[PDB]
Amino acid sequence: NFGAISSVLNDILSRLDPPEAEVQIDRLITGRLQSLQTYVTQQLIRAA
Amino acid sequence: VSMTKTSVDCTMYICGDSIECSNLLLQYGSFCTQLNRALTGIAVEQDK
Amino acid sequence: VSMTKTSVDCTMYICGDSIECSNLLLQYGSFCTQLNRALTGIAVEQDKNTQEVFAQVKQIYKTPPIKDFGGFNFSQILPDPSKRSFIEDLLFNKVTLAIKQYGDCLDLICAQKFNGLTVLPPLLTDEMIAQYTSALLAGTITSGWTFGAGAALQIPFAMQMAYRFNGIGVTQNVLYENQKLIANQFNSAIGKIQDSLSSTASALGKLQDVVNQNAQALNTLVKQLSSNFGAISSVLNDILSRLDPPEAEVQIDRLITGRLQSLQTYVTQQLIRAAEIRASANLAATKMSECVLGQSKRVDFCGKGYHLMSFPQSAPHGVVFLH
Amino acid sequence: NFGAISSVLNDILSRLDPPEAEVQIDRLITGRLQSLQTYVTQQLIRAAEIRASANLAATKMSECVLGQSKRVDFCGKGYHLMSFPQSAPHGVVFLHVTYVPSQEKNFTTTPAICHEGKAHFPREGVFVSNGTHWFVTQRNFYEPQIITTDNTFVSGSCDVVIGIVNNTVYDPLQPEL
Amino acid sequence: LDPLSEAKCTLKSLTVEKGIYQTSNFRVQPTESIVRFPNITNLCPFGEVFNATTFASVYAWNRKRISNCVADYSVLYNSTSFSTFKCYGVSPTKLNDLCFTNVYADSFVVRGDEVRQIAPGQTGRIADYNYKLPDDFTGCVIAWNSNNLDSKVGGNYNYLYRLFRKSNLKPFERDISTEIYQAGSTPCNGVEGFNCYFPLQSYGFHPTNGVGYQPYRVVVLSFELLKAPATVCGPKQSTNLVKNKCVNFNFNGLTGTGVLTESSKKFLPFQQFGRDIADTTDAVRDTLEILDITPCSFGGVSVITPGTNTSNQVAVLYQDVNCTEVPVAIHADQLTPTWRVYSTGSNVFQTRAGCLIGAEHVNNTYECDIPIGAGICASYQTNSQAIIAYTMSLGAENSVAYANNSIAIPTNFTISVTTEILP
Ligand SMILES: *[C@@H]1O[C@H](CO)[C@@H](O[C@@H]2O[C@H](CO)[C@@H](O)[C@H](O)[C@H]2NC(C)=O)[C@H](O)[C@H]1NC(C)=O
Ligand SMILES: *[C@@H]1O[C@H](CO)[C@@H](O[C@@H]2O[C@H](CO)[C@@H](O)[C@H](O)[C@H]2NC(C)=O)[C@H](O)[C@H]1NC(C)=O
Ligand SMILES: *[C@@H]1O[C@H](CO)[C@@H](O[C@@H]2O[C@H](CO)[C@@H](O)[C@H](O)[C@H]2NC(C)=O)[C@H](O)[C@H]1NC(C)=O
Ligand SMILES: *[C@@H]1O[C@H](CO)[C@@H](O)[C@H](O)[C@H]1NC(C)=O
Ligand SMILES: *[C@@H]1O[C@H](CO)[C@@H](O)[C@H](O)[C@H]1NC(C)=O
Ligand SMILES: *[C@@H]1O[C@H](CO)[C@@H](O)[C@H](O)[C@H]1NC(C)=O
Ligand SMILES: *[C@@H]1O[C@H](CO)[C@@H](O)[C@H](O)[C@H]1NC(C)=O
Ligand SMILES: *[C@@H]1O[C@H](CO)[C@@H](O)[C@H](O)[C@H]1NC(C)=O
Ligand SMILES: *[C@@H]1O[C@H](CO)[C@@H](O)[C@H](O)[C@H]1NC(C)=O
Ligand SMILES: *[C@@H]1O[C@H](CO)[C@@H](O)[C@H](O)[C@H]1NC(C)=O
Ligand SMILES: *[C@@H]1O[C@H](CO)[C@@H](O)[C@H](O)[C@H]1NC(C)=O
Ligand SMILES: *[C@@H]1O[C@H](CO)[C@@H](O)[C@H](O)[C@H]1NC(C)=O
């Protein structure tokens, strides 16, 4: 969830107005970006 | 000698098919290109 | 051999001249010191890398005036009265590098400098490195391999080459009966190398990639300041001018978190690249010890064939070996 | 604080209701997770370097202690003779024993000796002179010996060699008997 | 206070070891403040909006336009009292130091209960069929009770609203038609019979009603901030333009700290601000000229210290400043008296790295002790005790006696034992 009401984007979008939905979607975006960046860094460390 | 080469679609991993999420990801500021450059360098190194 | 040394001002990159942002950055908890320690370690390692490869012998031998070496001609690699050789000049011209003053800019470099991103100069200037390489060349062509052990002992050049032919498994008389032909072949090969370097085509892409990578990373840092990171705007003045401090704290905290993440990604990738540069420097120091100071019997270490000798030349951020 | 009202969880919990407390506790959780992840990444980056150094010390244990190495400046400066290991906290120490020549002397030399229209080259060593006599000596130590047909092999003719000189080869057998 | 104090604060310790150290700023603090606002002395009409005798119905709102005025609202304090006032996109304490763009004023009359529906993201008959507000709305909503002016003893039936509509209204859209709503099938054809309704209905305002029924006058103000050339401002007083110093500029409601210089950039008539690659403002129209803002601090500063255990004396290196340009660069004359000493001195040497102040230059070459860079090192030595700066020596010098018929043979040897440490 990363602090949002749910981990599914459809539930957040279906039940909330775009101004309210922005904060939850921003939380999800930050979390998933962090996951991708951790994956990439460990891939570089193994490639070495 | 080598390892597997991978590629990631940043918008499909984070947003899926949601237009609203894609607009928010544009506003947020995307560093997906940097991740892609790192992965492409890894793949070229593996072939070398 | 080495890469560029950089320093970052954490508060100037994140906050600028905003007192309110600085107070919030103090409250937030600052790990800027850890980033600075990592960058300082990188810079010290880069100077150490440069030192190891070139400062191996601390006796500055001088080029011999007589220059009678039995028909072998070294004018293209010995210095010329920044005291660099012909081939070193060609190499320094094939690589295109990337005091700036407040009056000078009042260009990407000053866009970096206004945001806390500075580049530090190396300890050894290029003249010093050229003096090191010329000392190595003089020592090798006068005393052969003896100088490496500890004390230089002069020996005529043809005698050295005879002992190298014995080294690879061919008897002396093969050199002494073919001396002029071998000298001509060596001179022609040096000529071909010079012609290849003077062509437009560049073989120094390995040394150009370092410069491109450094510039790309430092420019990505500056481009990444326009990201809103979920706030109303990416400019601190708009947030401060239009909102009360209690309301402004949440937006400024969002911006602080984003910019801290950007700095931490930059630092981590710099460490990952420094490891690889250190590997390459260690390789070039082993090759300086074993291909230049000695005759190597390892296969394909000092080129393809049976090794006879090697000569070093200095290049921007790196070294070149003629095997 | 990481943007929360305080850095102590008890103050946040004691003064606020669970719905209000969730946002502050989430801020703290995110910050502390980031701290742990930075620690782990830098530990991996250092482990790689320690592994490089360990591999180097295993190659040096195999080649400088178990064998005599001919690589230059691998087992110290000089000509390698042997090495001894000692253990140290978190590491290893090598004592390298090497041979360093000294007390040099200037001599005059030649590529070959011409006896009777035949060139003579040393089998191992170099021809040296003290200014009156010609001898053959080993390269790394001074040990002059009289030139005989067992020190020098014969090949070719005198004309080809640029710096050949004239001298005599002993040919032991015939004069002794 | 000092370069050494900067180093101590940066390192978080009371003792500083031997070494050259990078430092943060701390030295400069802004103290002045300029203001630039347009020449507008025509007060906005707060008498022909709030005091208007007749207000519109909610189904057909006025949508008035405002420009070329100063927006001083304290002139209302004596005359009117507002029961509702809420602002979106801006804080109510900054309203007196900002210049607004594209200002519009919408006006109508609702009942007391339906005031709460004038807000972004609401539902109800007024939000659905009469008046709608955008999700990203910047502006303010004001409402006040008017049971003295809009209520008649017999009843006031001149205010109307829409009750039936096929679909919801979009933001800032109006509908003044009066067709006949068709509840079911069997089209109406204007008969107005059964399942065919006239869509507009009338509020009935009597003086003796509940507070919820009582009439409430509503005004909505719409504007934009810091985007384009503005014309409505706030009660403030322009001040002289102190130039070439670290100040707070506050140009047309945009605040910050910086330095102002002339620019050759040309702006289209609808542009006033300009942003660069890092998205921060660099060019501002002022006279109608375009000026340029530059940060307060520029470049790096380093401190060379032989260690706090030995002495409290230090040297300072400026990396990007040719000497004689140092005082302007580091904004001297605003620094404390101790910090000025370093700006100008007898012990000034220009190195390739930058300018070094506080160290004496010798003509001898020793081994490096503290690397300054570009071939320069520094050391703490007696002469009394001082910090000297010299050029490093690569090593000893000699030559080899080379000759085509000469050799050197060793006669003796040495057994050497050396140590190598590995983690
Ligand atoms: C070693 O090589 C250099 C470079 O070719 C020789 O110097 C040049 O020789 C040519 C001969 O035609 C002259 O025309 C040039 O003027 C010389 N100088 C330069 C800078 O090119 C040099 O003579 C060679 N050494 C020998 C033959 O002993
Ligand atoms: C070079 O070495 C030869 C051989 O050692 C020297 O010749 C000897 O000189 C001594 C001098 O007392 C005589 O007693 C020997 O009989 C000589 N040997 C022969 C074979 O003749 C020679 O003198 C040395 N030359 C120099 C300049 O030192
Ligand atoms: C703008 O006008 C169009 C056309 O009058 C409206 O579309 C009608 O909407 C109703 C409500 O669902 C439908 O029953 C009609 O069939 C639509 N007409 C057509 C031609 O498709 C539209 O609703 C109006 N927009 C707004 C915001 O009211
Ligand atoms: C610094 O100033 C001197 C004096 O005018 C000038 O000669 C020099 O070119 C300037 N720049 C540098 C890098 O020394
Ligand atoms: C050899 O001779 C040169 C000069 O001819 C002299 O400088 C050198 O010291 C001599 N070698 C030794 C070992 O003395
Ligand atoms: C050595 O050089 C001299 C000239 O300096 C020359 O006369 C002599 O013949 C050369 N000797 C040999 C063996 O080449
Ligand atoms: C060696 O002897 C031959 C024949 O006597 C003579 O021609 C030649 O010049 C001699 N060599 C030298 C170096 O004098
Ligand atoms: C408002 O209108 C009334 C009636 O004309 C008038 O008496 C009053 O002075 C006006 N007030 C203002 C502030 O215009
Ligand atoms: C404030 O409003 C009242 C209401 O009539 C008026 O009598 C009074 O004079 C006003 N204040 C001033 C200073 O005019
Ligand atoms: C505004 O006031 C200033 C005051 O000096 C004057 O110079 C200027 O002409 C006036 N008008 C404009 C459009 O700036
Ligand atoms: C040091 O060398 C410079 C350059 O020749 C000279 O101007 C200066 O007077 C010298 N100073 C001393 C103390 O030798
Ligand atoms: C070699 O050196 C040792 C110690 O310095 C000395 O005792 C010995 O006599 C030397 N040998 C010669 C031949 O000089």
Author numbering:
A (entry chain B): 969 to 1016
B (entry chain B): 729 to 776
C (entry chain A): 729 to 809, 813 to 829, 834 to 841, 848 to 1064
D (entry chain C): 969 to 1145
E (entry chain C): 293 to 578, 581 to 677, 689 to 728
From the primary publication:
SARS-CoV-2 belongs to the subgenus of sarbecoviruses, for which horseshoe bats (Rhinolophus sp.) are the reservoir species. A number of recent studies reported the existence of sarbecoviruses highly similar to SARS-CoV-2 in diseased Malayan pangolins (Manis javanica) and thus pangolins were proposed to have played a role in the emergence of the current pandemic. Here, we analyse ACE2-binding properties and the structure of S protein from a Pangolin-CoV closely related to SARS-CoV-28,9. To characterise the pangolin virus spike and compare it with that of SARS-CoV-2, we expressed and purified two different Pangolin-CoV spike ectodomains.
